[PDB]
């Protein structure tokens, strides 16, 4: 049981070369989803807003597959996120380094699937003027790879509805709508697409 | 495919001795450009201002070249910025350590050129008295190598115009002009020129 998981990890991690990331030849699809926990702080002097959310990331690597009958019927395991490649998904308009609120650990499944869900506090650019009214304020931040075009990393979402089932019920801010939408940009130059996921939150003082 | 890229990186990094930085006999030119995102806050009590920008840094190393044919037609790759030498480009008048907002990953092309774009938040010395006027305020900060004279690291810009096409449209502050200009400083005690890029931003509420 433990003996098998030790073999498994040793065969995937110590007796292999590290995955060098995706390429144009071997591209990778990353699935994104947001579970929005709280709008903590809105700063009207600087036009910054602070969110707390869970970012669900899912991808699949061939190099991480294993036959579960060779390893004691183990179907999945938990491992430090340092032991594996992780996509470089970034908020394009943060104003402070993102703060990580959760252990940096992933779940790997025998078909190569990786599920990695970091909890984060993000300050980003957003004008809260009018948040105290009935219409609210709308804010948006785009998430994407910092260095990979869509030829190497494709982003998708399973749903355009942000998960609000755990939004803090006594937040200073009530959520009016929260969507997460795949966006593709082309530039007049290059065949390669550029994908981001646009997180759009409309909120107001409760 | 992935095998080739692993080969290439092994050849360039593991089998290859550390590049020791430029030397007077092997000098290096770094191209700098700024993408201004936001003036985040001004502080009138301390004369500090906070910028958020992408700093494009591009340079070229002979020891990073490869023949694409020998590596499955690979023409470039992404790699962690720790895997390579990077230049020590520093703001000369910061008041806080820079905050890095983006992954530390660079793009390496088969001709040896490296493209590296850290997003940063910078606090630097700037007197915002008068931002709330129509003429606004002008501020400036020099970027350059901290330790290398112009005989080891030269600098340049592709354009004198800062990129404002990503400037946050609802920022508290609007930009009236933004330039990035190469300057030659003789500025200390040495008889050797140090090169900087002077970023000059005129802005107002």
């Amino acid at each position: 049981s433990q003996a098998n998981l030790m073999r498994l990890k040793s065969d995937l991690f110590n007796r292999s070369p590290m995955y060098p990331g995706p390429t144009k030849d071997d591209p990778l699809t990353v699935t994104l989803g947001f579970t929005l926990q709280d709008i903590v702080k809105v700063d009207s002097s600087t036009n910054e807003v602070d969110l707390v959310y869970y970012e669900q990331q899912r991808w699949k690597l061939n190099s991480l597959m294993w036959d579960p009958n060779e390893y004691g019927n183990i179907t999945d395991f938990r491992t430090s996120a340092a032991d594996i490649w992780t996509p470089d998904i970034t908020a394009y308009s943060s104003t402070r380094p993102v703060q990580v609120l959760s252990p940096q650990i992933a779940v790997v499944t025998h078909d190569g699937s990786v599920m990695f869900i970091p909890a984060q506090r993000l300050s980003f650019m957003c004008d809260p003027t009018g948040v105290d009214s009935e219409e609210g304020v709308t804010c948006a931040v785009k998430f994407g790879s910092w260095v990979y075009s869509g030829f190497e990393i494709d982003l998708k979402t399973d749903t355009d509805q942000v998960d609000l089932s755990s939004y803090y019920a006594s937040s200073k801010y009530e959520i009016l709508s929260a969507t997460q939408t795949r966006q593709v940009q082309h530039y007049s130059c290059c065949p390669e697409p550029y994908i981001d996921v646009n997180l759009v939150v409309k909120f107001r003082e409760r | 495919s992935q095998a080739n890229l692993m080969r290439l990186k092994s050849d360039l990094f593991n089998r290859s001795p550390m590049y020791p930085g430029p030397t007077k006999d092997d000098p290096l030119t770094v191209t700098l450009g700024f993408t201004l995102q936001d003036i985040v806050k001004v502080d009138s009590s301390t004369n500090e201002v906070d910028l958020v920008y992408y700093e494009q840094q591009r340079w070229k190393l002979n020891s990073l070249m490869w023949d694409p044919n020998e590596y499955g037609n690979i023409t470039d790759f992404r790699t962690s910025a720790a895997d390579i030498w990077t230049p020590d480009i520093t703001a000369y008048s910061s008041t806080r350590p820079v905050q890095v907002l983006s992954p530390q990953i660079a793009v390496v092309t088969h001709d040896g050129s490296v493209m590296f774009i850290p997003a940063q938040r910078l606090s630097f010395m700037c007197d915002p008295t008068g931002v709330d006027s129509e003429e606004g305020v002008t501020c400036a900060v020099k970027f350059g190598s901290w330790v290398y004279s112009g005989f080891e690291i030269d600098l340049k810009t592709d354009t004198d115009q800062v990129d404002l096409s990503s400037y946050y449209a609802s920022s508290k502050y609007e930009i009236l002009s933004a330039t990035q200009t190469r300057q030659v400083q003789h500025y200390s005690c040495c008889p050797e020129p140090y090169i900087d890029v002077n970023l000059v931003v005129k802005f107002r509420e």
Partner: peptide, 13 residues
């Protein structure tokens, strides 16, 4: 455009 995007930019200069 292109050369503002941290992912088109290796193709610009």
């Amino acid at each position: 455009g292109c050369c503002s995007d941290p992912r088109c930019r290796y193709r610009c200069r």
